[PDB]
């Protein structure tokens, strides 16, 4: 109940929203049916349109007008945005040459440059080029400010998840808005686009920018607009707030456009009907920039133009139906569309089995346009698992497709030609970033980056300390002229031991077997002391950022940090030059596993547990195939280079090691590789402690990794060998799930050359993802600036064309 009896006179677009039942005059009041009776009349004036004309110039102020062309309008701060152009012979902002903004040029009394965030729903990254003729204002922001060729959204590439990630710097799994539609089993409530429940505060985790600003004494403009308030009125309101006295004036403002998403759904991302919404967005930016120029604020304000996600071609006929796969289709609830989430229709049905649902959905039709996953098996790069609102069963849908439960669902709701929500690496889902203002660089292109990074930059732009978030603070320093955040490397928590030869062969009872001069006796000793370590450890050793017990182990071909707790390396580092040659494992060595005389029996794995364990086999982190000499090859068979691997995963791993590593070395002019295991049993994206481990090799204390990573670094200028690189580096990485089958790869009964590399590409990763997952910190010793290294660690090789 609102007692909507009060008035909006002098209260129009009030910045602090007043408590019910007293009636509201804020920019959100409509969406709560809480506006005062006079709201439309006083606050949503429309009389005479949105532009001055020759004859309106110098008029006597008529308060009924939408915007004013009277002499006093400037001081009052309510001129039509084109006032100085029509009435005072000024040019539109878009027609002025760009001129570097070296310092904020602000009115007296501004304590900091304001920030205006202009967000555009569904503005696909390629619109910047493809619509450039019809967007002259946006193009001036882009070419004159700082821009990326695209910005990567989060998954799912839906509106609420993305806008809330922009607000908070958090993955959907951490901020809680994991979809446009949601069921929270703890609350026993549902969240939908339509309706009331989405307003409840308990959905919305982390700390969004407006709250971060308020808590630190920076005033925030209300970010949210009732959809019926026209764009022109939103702009005029922002311009008005900017004319408030110093003590009342917000420092941050948000404009949101429903376009071009709204049209893109009806017409497809490139439908001829898409030109007009692009034109209309540009005209709005034009009104903002003209308005700012009138207030002499156009070289004072920082402007961010940002989208939430792109838009792909999707139609009704491209729908897969679960009723074509599942005989039990009525015992499940499906969250449908460009992704799928499945749970039980009723928690009192004890015969609902997720395992058989997955199996009934796996590789069933030759061209199947979705792939089922238990959520913990989704690519770790999506960070989409650690929230009770995310159903155990997930369908990753092919771009251009929909999944639905039954055909009735589709023709009882073709309506649409565009949709979004797909995997966030998909090109059609990429969106835009442009920054313009005194704090951004001038005419600068930056590489693509993820929207999780922006909250930190918006905090930097406002002088705020950001709440804990998933950006890597400093990785976007190269967007900024000043206000950079200068981080230190985290301190190493555990120092390693450097064990020498301490154990006799006969002390080892591991059930392991191996059929195995003074010049090269001193030589092998110096290799064990770390003489080739500068060849194999190019960027320093990784720092261990938690308390644990580990050893550095040197060898001719590789260096490793061996964990006495997990009985295996945390990391193994080796360099493969362009010249290097693949040899095979000789037969006298096929099942060779050798005790490592530097490491006690008690901190070692044993062959017997592998023999006993009928499901589990073993692989090696340094590949024997790439040993530098037959003598060095013995080092690769050390029990300390051994890790648990399912036979089905060995197919993957062997092909990577035997074929792909050499291929990358030829193509990249040497590669440095760091490989190791990952334990993420509770799927939170963070290194597990030992008491979190759910699986061991039968009858032993050997813990089973959930994933295996590799980080493959070379010189960005590939005319220089990886081990002799003078400048910036180039990286690609992966986090492969360690799975007892290859059900994920539909063509896996074929030759590894037809499916392994595609699987690795699917599970591409940022070094930073690996850092979270291992508690390690990489590239500690390079000659590059730390900010540049943070940028490299956030890089994701996506394997999408141009």
Ligand X SMILES: *[C@@H]1O[C@H](CO)[C@@H](O[C@@H]2O[C@H](CO)[C@@H](O[C@@H]3O[C@H](CO[C@H]4O[C@H](CO)[C@@H](O)[C@H](O[C@H]5O[C@H](CO)[C@@H](O)[C@H](O)[C@@H]5O[C@H]5O[C@H](CO)[C@@H](O)[C@H](O)[C@@H]5O)[C@@H]4O)[C@@H](O)[C@H](O[C@H]4O[C@H](CO)[C@@H](O)[C@H](O)[C@@H]4O[C@H]4O[C@H](CO)[C@@H](O)[C@H](O)[C@@H]4O)[C@@H]3O)[C@H](O)[C@H]2NC(C)=O)[C@H](O)[C@H]1NC(C)=O
**The only residue of 136, 205, 448, 487 in contact with ligand X, by rule CB under 6 A:** 205
Helix or strand holding residue 528 (H, E) = helix 519-529
**The only residue of 87, 167, 182, 712 in contact with ligand Y3K, by rule CB under 6 A:** 167
Q: What is the CA radius of gyration of the chain?
A: 30
Q: Quote the CA–CA distance of 564 and 596 in Å, as a whole number.
A: 13
Helix or strand holding residue 788 (H, E) = helix 786-794
Using CB under 6 A, which residues numbered 754 to 773 contact ligand X?
A: 772
**Residue number with CB closer to K ion (464 or 616):** 616
Q: Is 692 in the site for ligand X (CB under 6 A)?
A: no
**What angle, rounded to 10 degrees, do the helices at 275-294 and 231-241 form?**
20
**The only residue of 137, 470, 556, 606 in contact with ligand X, by rule CB under 6 A:** 470
Supply the minimum distance, in Å, between the C-beta of residue 257 and ligand Y3K: 9
Helix or strand holding residue 163 (H, E) = helix 159-168
3-class DSSP state of 553: strand
**According to the 3-state scheme, what is the secondary structure of 93-154?**
HHHCCCCCCCCCCCCCCCCCCCEEEEEEECCCCCHHHHCHHHCHHHHHHHHHCEECCCEECC
* Phi/psi of residue 611, nearest 5 degrees: -70, -50
Catalog residues that contact Zn ion under the rule CB under 5 A: 261
With CB under 5 to 8 Å by kind, the binding choice for 166 among Cl ion, ligand Y3K, Ca ion, none is ligand Y3K
β-pairing, 642-645 vs 617-620, is antiparallel
Q: Is 180 in the site for Cl ion (CB under 5 A)?
A: yes
- Residue 253 to residues 114, 234, 494: CA-CA distances in angstroms? 8, 11, 45
- Choose one: 174-182, 183-191, 270-278, 740-748; the region binding Cl ion (CB under 5 A): 174-182
Q: Is 119 in the site for ligand Y3K (CB under 6 A)?
A: yes
Supply the minimum distance, in Å, between the C-beta of residue 156 and Cl ion: 6
Q: Is 685 in the site for ligand X (CB under 6 A)?
A: yes
Q: Which of 81, 157, 159, 439 is catalytic?
A: 159
Supply the minimum distance, in Å, between the C-beta of residue 761 and Na ion: 16
Give the per-residue contact string, 596-615, with K ion (x = CB under 5 A; - = no).
--------------x--x--
Q: Is 680 in the site for Ca ion (CB under 5 A)?
A: yes
Using CB under 5 A, which residues numbered 748 to 787 contact Na ion?
A: 748
Q: Is 466 in the site for ligand X (CB under 6 A)?
A: no
Supply the minimum distance, in Å, between the C-beta of residue 614 and K ion: 6
Q: Quote the CA–CA distance of 712 and 734 in Å, as a whole number.
A: 9
Q: Is 308 in the site for Ca ion (CB under 5 A)?
A: yes
**Residue number with CB closer to ligand Y3K (225 or 683):** 225
Supply the minimum distance, in Å, between the C-beta of residue 778 and K ion: 32
C-alpha 131: how far from its chain's center? 26
Residue with tokens 């992704």: 339
3-class DSSP state of 566: coil
Q: Is 256 in the site for ligand Y3K (CB under 6 A)?
A: yes
Q: Is 176 in the site for ligand X (CB under 6 A)?
A: yes
Tokens of 490: 């985290």
**The only residue of 123, 160, 255, 566 in contact with ligand Y3K, by rule CB under 6 A:** 160
Residue with tokens 């206000």: 483
Q: Quote the CA–CA distance of 802 and 794 in Å, as a whole number.
A: 20
Q: Is 255 in the site for ligand Y3K (CB under 6 A)?
A: no
Residue showing the smallest CB distance to Cl ion in the complex: 179
> Is 159 marked active-site?
yes
Q: Quote the CA–CA distance of 801 and 610 in Å, as a whole number.
A: 43
- Residue 722 to residues 129, 665, 703, 776, 780: CA-CA distances in angstroms? 35, 9, 34, 22, 17
**Residue number with CB closer to ligand Y3K (470 or 560):** 470
Supply the minimum distance, in Å, between the C-beta of residue 418 and ligand Y3K: 9
- Residue 459 to residues 257, 508, 640: CA-CA distances in angstroms? 22, 57, 46
Q: Quote the CA–CA distance of 491 and 559 in Å, as a whole number.
A: 22
Report, as residue numbers or ranges, the catalytic residues. Answer: 159
* Contact residues: Na ion, CB under 5 A: 742, 745, 748
Give the binding site for ligand X (CB under 6 A): 170-171, 173-176, 205-206, 383, 386-388, 468-470, 685-686, 772
Interface contacts to ligand Y3K, rule CB under 6 A: 117, 119, 121, 159-160, 163-164, 166-167, 193, 209, 223-225, 227, 254, 256, 258, 261, 306
Residues that bind Ca ion (CB under 5 A): 121, 159, 261, 308, 680, 682, 684, 686, 688
């Amino acid at each position: 109940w609102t007692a909507t009896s009060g008035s909006c006179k002098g209260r129009c677009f009030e910045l602090q929203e007043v408590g019910p039942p007293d009636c509201r005059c804020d920019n959100l009041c409509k969406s709560y049916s809480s506006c005062c009776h006079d709201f439309d009349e006083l606050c949503l004036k429309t009389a005479r349109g949105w532009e001055c004309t020759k004859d309106r110039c110098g008029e006597v102020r008529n308060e009924e007008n939408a915007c004013h062309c009277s002499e006093d309008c400037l001081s009052r701060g309510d001129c039509c945005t084109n006032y100085q152009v029509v009435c005072k012979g000024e040019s539109h902002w878009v027609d002025d040459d760009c001129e570097e903004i070296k310092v904020p040029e602000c009115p007296a009394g501004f304590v900091r440059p304001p920030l205006i965030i202009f967000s555009v729903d569904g503005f696909r990254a390629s619109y910047m080029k493809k619509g450039s003729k019809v967007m002259p204002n946006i193009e001036k922001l882009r070419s004159c400010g700082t821009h990326a060729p695209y910005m990567r959204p989060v998954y799912p590439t839906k509106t609420f998840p993305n806008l809330y990630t922009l607000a908070t710097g958090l993955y959907p799994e951490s901020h809680g808005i994991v979809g446009n539609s949601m069921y929270d089993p703890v609350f026993d409530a549902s969240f939908h686009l339509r309706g009331r429940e989405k307003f409840n505060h308990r959905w919305w985790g982390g700390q969004p920018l407006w709250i971060t600003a308020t808590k630190q004494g920076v005033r925030a403009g209300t970010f949210f607009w009732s959809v019926s308030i026209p764009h022109e009125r939103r702009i005029l309101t922002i311009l008005q707030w900017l004319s408030l006295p110093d003590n009342e004036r917000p420092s941050v403002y948000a404009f949101y456009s429903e376009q071009p998403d709204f049209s893109g759904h009806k017409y497809g991302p490139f439908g001829p009907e898409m030109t007009n919404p692009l034109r209309e967005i540009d005209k709005t930016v034009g009104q903002l920039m003209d308005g700012l120029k009138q207030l002499r604020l156009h070289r004072c304000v920082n402007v961010i133009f940002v989208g939430d996600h792109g838009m792909e071609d999707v139609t009704c006929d491209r729908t897969e139906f679960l009723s074509n796969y599942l005989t039990n289709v009525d015992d499940i609830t499906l969250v449908p569309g460009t992704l799928g989430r499945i749970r039980a229709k009723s928690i009192n049905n004890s015969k609902y089995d997720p395992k058989t649902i997955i199996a009934a959905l796996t590789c069933k039709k030759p061209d199947q346009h979705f792939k089922p996953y238990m959520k913990q098996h989704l690519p770790k790069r999506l960070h989409y698992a650690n929230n009770r609102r995310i159903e155990d069963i997930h369908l990753l849908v092919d771009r251009r497709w929909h999944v639905a439960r039954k055909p009735l669902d589709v023709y009882k709701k073709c309506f649409f030609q565009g949709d979004h929500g797909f995997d966030n690496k998909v090109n059609s889902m990429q969106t835009v970033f442009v920054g313009y203002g005194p704090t951004f660089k001038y005419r600068t292109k930056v590489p693509p980056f993820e929207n999780i990074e922006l909250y930190n930059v918006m905090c930097d732009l406002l002088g705020l300390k950001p709440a804990p978030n998933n950006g890597t603070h400093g990785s976007l320093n190269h967007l900024l002229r000043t206000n950079t955040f200068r981080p230190t490397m985290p301190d190493e928590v555990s120092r390693p031991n450097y064990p020498g030869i301490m154990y006799l062969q006969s002390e080892f009872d591991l059930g392991c077997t191996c059929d195995d001069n003074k010049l090269e006796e001193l030589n092998k000793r110096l290799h064990t002391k770390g003489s080739t370590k500068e060849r194999h450890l190019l960027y320093g050793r990784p720092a261990v950022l938690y308390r644990t017990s580990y050893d550095i182990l040197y060898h001719t071909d590789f260096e490793s940090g061996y964990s006495e707790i997990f009985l295996m390396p945390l990391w193994t580092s080796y360099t493969i030059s362009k010249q290097a040659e693949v040899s095979s494992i000789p037969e006298h060595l096929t099942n060779c596993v050798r005790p490592d005389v530097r490491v006690s029996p008690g901190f070692s794995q044993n062959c017997l547990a592998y023999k006993n364990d009928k499901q589990m086999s073993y692989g090696f982190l340094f590949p024997p195939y790439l040993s530098s000499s037959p003598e060095a090859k013995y080092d690769a068979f050390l029990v300390t280079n051994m890790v648990p691997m399912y036979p089905a995963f060995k197919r993957v791993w062997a092909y990577f090691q035997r074929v792909l590593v050499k291929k990358y070395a030829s193509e990249r002019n040497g590669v440095n590789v760091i490989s190791g295991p990952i334990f993420d049993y509770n799927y939170d994206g963070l290194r597990d402690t030992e008491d979190e481990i759910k699986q061991y090799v039968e009858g032993s204390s050997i813990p089973v990794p959930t994933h295996y990573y590799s980080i493959i670094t070379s010189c960005l200028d590939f005319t220089q060998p990886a081990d002799k690189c003078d400048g910036p580096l180039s990286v690609s990485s992966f986090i492969l799930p360690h799975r007892p089958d290859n059900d994920e790869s539909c063509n896996s009964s074929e030759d590894e050359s037809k499916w392994v590399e595609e699987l690795m590409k699917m599970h591409t990763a940022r070094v930073r993802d690996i850092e979270h997952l291992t508690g390690l910190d990489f590239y500690r010793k390079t000659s590059r600036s730390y900010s540049e290294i943070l940028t490299l660690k956030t890089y994701l090789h996506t394997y999408e064309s141009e």
